[PDB]
Amino acid sequence: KVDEYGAKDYRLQMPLKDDHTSRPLWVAPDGHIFLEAFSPVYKYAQDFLVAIAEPVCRPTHVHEYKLTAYSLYAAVSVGLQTSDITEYLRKLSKTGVPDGIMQFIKLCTVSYGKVKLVLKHNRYFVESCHPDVIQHLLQDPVIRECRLRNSEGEATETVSFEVKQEMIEELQKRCIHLEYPLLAEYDFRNDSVNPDINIDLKPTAVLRPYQEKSLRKMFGNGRARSGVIVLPCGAGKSLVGVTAACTVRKRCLVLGNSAVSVEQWKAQFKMWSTIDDSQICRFTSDAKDKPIGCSVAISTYSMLGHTTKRSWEAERVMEWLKTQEWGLMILDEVHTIPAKMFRRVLTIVQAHCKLGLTATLVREDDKIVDLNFLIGPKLYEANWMELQNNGYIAKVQCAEVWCPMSPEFYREYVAIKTKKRILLYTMNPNKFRACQFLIKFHERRNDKIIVFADNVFALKEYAIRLNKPYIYGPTSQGERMQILQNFKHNPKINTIFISKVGDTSFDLPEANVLIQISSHGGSRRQEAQRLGRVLRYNAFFYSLVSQDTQEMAYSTKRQRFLVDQGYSFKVITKLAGMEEEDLAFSTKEEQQQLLQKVLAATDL
Amino acid sequence: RNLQEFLGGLSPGVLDRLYGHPATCLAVFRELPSLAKNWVMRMLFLEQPLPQAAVALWVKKEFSKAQEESTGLLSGLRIWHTQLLPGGLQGLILNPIFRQNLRIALLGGGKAWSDDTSQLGPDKHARDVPSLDKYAEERWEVVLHFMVGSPSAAVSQDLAQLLSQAGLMKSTEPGEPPCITSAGFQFLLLDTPAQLWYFMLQYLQTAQSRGMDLVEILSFLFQLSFSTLGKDYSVEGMSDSLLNFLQHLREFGLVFQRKRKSRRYYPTRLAINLSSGFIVVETNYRLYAYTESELQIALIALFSEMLYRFPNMVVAQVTRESVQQAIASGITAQQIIHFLRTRAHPVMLKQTPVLPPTITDQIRLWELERDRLRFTEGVLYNQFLSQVDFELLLAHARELGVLVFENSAKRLMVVTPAGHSDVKRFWKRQKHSS
Amino acid sequence: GTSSQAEAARILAASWPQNREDEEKQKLKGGPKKTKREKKAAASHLFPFEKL
Amino acid sequence: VLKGVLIECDPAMKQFLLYLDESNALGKKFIIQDIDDTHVFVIAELVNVLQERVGELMDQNAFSLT
């Protein structure tokens, strides 16, 4: 509150430091939690805080968590009550809980189960234990359009009324503004209306304890609620979805991003669910394996939200699919859910539980907050540091090594400003030499290398120079598949180039070295995904940037997610044995010749 | 500077007189390298000088460099001296006074370093070790606050004069408080034992100004260094000037004494370490300090941005702007790294190294930002008609030692502004002789 | 050209972050290694291509 | 003869100053003589604006976390 040194000081607010340091926790007046990792009670405190708050940074020593309304909603969703959470927060405080946190917690936890949203007979209803809140929200003009025709009082038994199916998003957005959050609880134990299927996972797909925590938190008191589970791509993510689908024991719908992710999900189901191929169907207009009359259906976005004329078979399949309820609608790559057309996909189909899975929840345009009410609260957030400490995730040694700008390029870089400088620092001869040196060094030790590089125009001359396979991206379907298939089981070739194609969840084989050059502007999601393609010092990945250019600021601003995850980027300024062997662009003649071809774009 | 550097610059008589006290001999011995200590111990009971080759054959050929360094250090400290062995050989034997005093300090003999303690009986107003440590910390914090200039610290005028002579603060205008210079900031950033040692060295360099015996002060300081914590000693048996010096120690918190006329004085933990963690650093450029005194808070805020201040905790973030500002204030990155390492929390001591390499490398890179451009005022010469004429003028400039940059390819050279006049006269004189 | 290789190597190898690191190295490394564990820590934090 | 200040830096900053000379970003051609690939000779009466421009270039592509 005081700014003697520019720091928000709350020394007077929380003096309760009786005796003496045994509680490894610190609270903040507005809201924040600081945890000491080097404490004997570290595991218990972590288990308590994860269930009540989401983390904001997890370095090696002092973890920092944040208290939010949705975090408290998730906490009270589990069996934890207000008294228990308050008494345990006061138990481990070492400073005393400020009288600004108790009121906030009380306000958040009081209005949790007052209003519920239920789906029955393809009809959406809002049910309230306390009838007064119905009249309280009745005066809201936006809610009045949901009822049709005006939904007199829907006298049942508990006061409820119907709402418009296509406008469920608007009322969900308004309810949190009215401090009456809605909950999506599906009691799959006793339905007797749904034709529950005979899915049953084989008793040989063992799961790690960290997945056990997420699964247990999903099913707190015998019911499944919508939520988001964040696990690394190298870790077991699809396994959690398969286990959740098996436990729900209802008709499942899986949504992917790419047309190849549906094959990945089908393979996962065939591997860890023991379901016949007749029930499993993929709806992506490629094989048409009779999606009508199916137990589990797997499809992708951009097809359920078509704004144009749809295929006759696809139209009939969509008409069939929009006529029945769904149990545990699974979404993959949930981070890119809040889009113009992807959001309505949630409102275009009817489902009880919406389970979203992702590895990189970070996104620009601050639309992640919308995902809190679009699907649900952030359920589980895996601690990557302790995950790799167990040895089941590769300990990747992150590196941020920059190269100086050659004089033949820096004059043109500072001369041009009309967006034509993107290729200039991308095609830095020094960065080219560094990349070639790294490629040769890691090939000499037989390490699999994946080289990410945006700006496919630069990637052309970057890959043809070394005569190495590259994926332009619109090459074909077969060529990419065979290239990736022979990439892993071939000692002759062990390095490939990717142009923004590997920025999603694919079936790329295990790799130990990743070298990214000229990535997107500030996409923390892209860098996190690329880092996810390596883990599965077992491995290490490098990022090459050009000094005195916008790439420096871009790399600095796009690594703030991984440092919060706990990774540290060592800076490498010198490469050992740079002049030991011969590299490309050794002399100035070809370096200055590169200027003409890099300025030859002239895309005007 | 270390103790050996100061001792080596002293006259042989001063070194000989210093060895007359058993406490001084032990302090000198413990400063020696590991190889030197073995040689001293071996030659402890030798009444005859040894040949230089015989001593040289004890160490292997590969470690001859360390042997030469240790021998040179011993010769500079005058622990031993070369003796003209009969037959043209050179014999090496330790100083008899130093050897005798070291044996007395080790084996025993003579009287005790302190006069006595049981003559006056138990102390009526004795304190405890935590109380002595608290008093020393309070005195040191008061001194450091007076360095800043806050009115909360009031010290003697002689201390201000000593600080002015030390160069930390200068009194440009009489009457007004002195302004702390960049060297003052650098000293403030230094570690507490290092600050004590620097202050003592500055006192000793100016000790002759007050007409005080350097040997007596050094002997008393060394005796205090080996003193047992929590045990008092007799003031009596010392010259008056030393007593005055002791009073200054009472001002500095090294020695506790209830009254000026009291015959007892309690050495503190600071005095013990004069002869020679609470900060957690995270990979995300965050400092978590378990400190409460405003001194540590100010020191951390000098090179970092404060974020939170819990009653027993300080959460700060190390940013590029803060480090750049601290460097512009005159503090180097090496000093910051050493300060962080010294105050490092015991938990971080498990890590090898204690501080993560990324943070130190980032700090060093931020330090290199300031000196990206190098500036050298001078005069440029570009009117050389002949290469031979250019070569002669360049040789003359190099002889004068005023050359800054040379380019023989284009016959271009730069000289310092002071040396421009000499170069101009030389060039004019050569044309006159032509 | 023979001289082109040397000129390019001189320009690239020591352009920004060597003209001050080499000066510090020349003006430093006078005292011996404090402990052998510093070399172990350096080897553990160094990437494999910096060990050869 | 010419009187001024010799500036030594990396070739990148040297060519940045060369570009500033021709772009007239400071108002004149005060970058008079270039002597070496990494050294320049500039008049001393406006070193402050050059320092300000260099600092602006340096912290522009920095993304200070404050």
Please check if A223 is assigned to a binding site: no
D9 contact partners, CB below 8 Å, separation of at least 6: B372, B373, B374, D38
User: Could you write out the three-class secondary structure of A211-222?
Assistant: HHHHHHHHECCC
Contact A60 B311 (CB under 8 A): no
A343 contact partners, CB below 8 Å, separation of at least 6: A169, A337, A370, A374
Tokens of B434: 């032509």
CB B193 within 8 A of CB B74: no
Residue-wise DSSP of A396-459: EEEEEEEEPPPHHHHHHHHH--SSTTHHHHHT-HHHHHHHHHHHHHHHHTT--EEEEES-HHHH
Dist CA A98 CA A89 (whole Å): 11
Alpha helix (H) ranges present in B253-386?
Answer: 269-272, 294-301, 320-328, 333-342, 357-370
Please check if A411 is assigned to a binding site: no
Nearest to B368 among C20, C41, C45 (CB): C20
Tell me which residue of B330, B326, B316 sits closest to B363, measured CA to CA. B326
Dist CA A60 CA A567 (whole Å): 9
Tell me which residue of B110, B107, B102 sits closest to B40, measured CA to CA. B102
- What is the DSSP code (8-state) at residue B235? -
Contact B352 C40 (CB under 8 A): yes
| DSSP H or E segment with residue B97 | helix B96-106
Nearest 10 degrees: Cα torsion D57, D60, D65, D66? 90
Contact A411 D65 (CB under 8 A): no
CB A454 within 8 A of CB A487: no
Q: What is the resolution of this structure in A?
A: 3.6
Identify each DSSP E strand in A133-285 by its residue range: 159-162, 185-186, 224-225, 227-230, 252-256, 281-283
> Which chain C residues touch D57 with a CB distance below 8 Å?
none
| For testing contact with chain B, the best of C29, C45, C50 (most B CBs within 10 A) | C45
Dist CA A597 CA A457 (whole Å): 11
A568 backbone dihedrals φ, ψ, rounded to 5°: -120, 135
Nearest to C41 among B352, B368, B372 (CB): B352
CB A220 within 8 A of CB A369: no
Amino acid at B356: P
> Which chain D residues touch C16 with a CB distance below 8 Å?
10, 12
Chain D touched by A404 (CB under 8 Å): yes
A505 backbone dihedrals φ, ψ, rounded to 5°: -90, 105
Identify each DSSP E strand in A77-144 by its residue range: 115-120, 123-128
Nearest to B353 among C16, C17, C41 (CB): C41
Dist CA A121 CA B433 (whole Å): 116
What sign has the CA pseudo-torsion B9, B10, B16, B20? negative
What was the experiment behind these coordinates?
cryo-EM
Rg, Å, chain C Cα set: 16
Chain C touched by A578 (CB under 8 Å): yes
Dist CA B177 CA B161 (whole Å): 11
Rg, Å, chain D Cα set: 13
Chain C touched by D37 (CB under 8 Å): yes
Length of chain B in terms of residues written: 434
| For testing contact with chain D, the best of C16, C18, C23 (most D CBs within 10 A) | C16
Which subunits have 3 or more CB–CB pairs within 8 Å of chain B? Answer: A, C, D
Nearest to A7 among B282, B309, B365 (CB): B309
- What is the DSSP code (8-state) at residue A297? E
Cα separations (Å) of A481 from A130, A267, A456, A473?
Answer: 58, 16, 19, 11
Tell me which residue of B24, B34, B31 sits closest to B95, measured CA to CA. B24
CB B233 within 8 A of CB B227: yes
Chain B: give the shortest CA distance to residue C36, in Å: 12
What sign has the CA pseudo-torsion A499, A504, A507, A513? positive
B19 contact partners, CB below 8 Å, separation of at least 6: B25, B28, B95, B97, B98, B101
Chain C: give the shortest CA distance to residue D38, in Å: 9
Dist CA A384 CA A374 (whole Å): 26
Contact B352 C17 (CB under 8 A): no
* Rounded to 5°, angle at Cα A57 from A56 and A59: 165
Which subunits have 3 or more CB–CB pairs within 8 Å of chain A? Answer: B, C, D
Chain C touched by D10 (CB under 8 Å): yes
Identify each DSSP E strand in B97-240 by its residue range: 169-170, 179-180, 233-234
Q: Where are the domains of chain D?
A: 1-66
Nearest to A570 among B288, B348, B358 (CB): B358
Contact C19 D12 (CB under 8 A): no
Helix (H, G, I), strand (E, B) or coil at B414: strand
Chain B touched by C38 (CB under 8 Å): yes
Please check if A524 is assigned to a binding site: no
Residue-wise DSSP of A165-195: GGGHHHHHHHHHHTT-----EE-TTS-SSS-
> Which chain A residues touch C13 with a CB distance below 8 Å?
578-579
Dist CA A517 CA A426 (whole Å): 7
Instruction: Return the number of other C-beta atoms located less than 10 Å from residue A410's C-beta.
Output: 28
> Which chain C residues touch A441 with a CB distance below 8 Å?
48-49
Dist CA A180 CA A183 (whole Å): 10
- What is the DSSP code (8-state) at residue A326? B
Q: How many helices (H) and strands (E) does chain D have?
A: 2, 3
Helix (H, G, I), strand (E, B) or coil at B259: coil
C-alpha atoms less than 13 angstroms from C-alpha of B80 in its C-beta half-sphere: 29
* Rounded to 5°, angle at Cα B90 from B85 and B93: 80
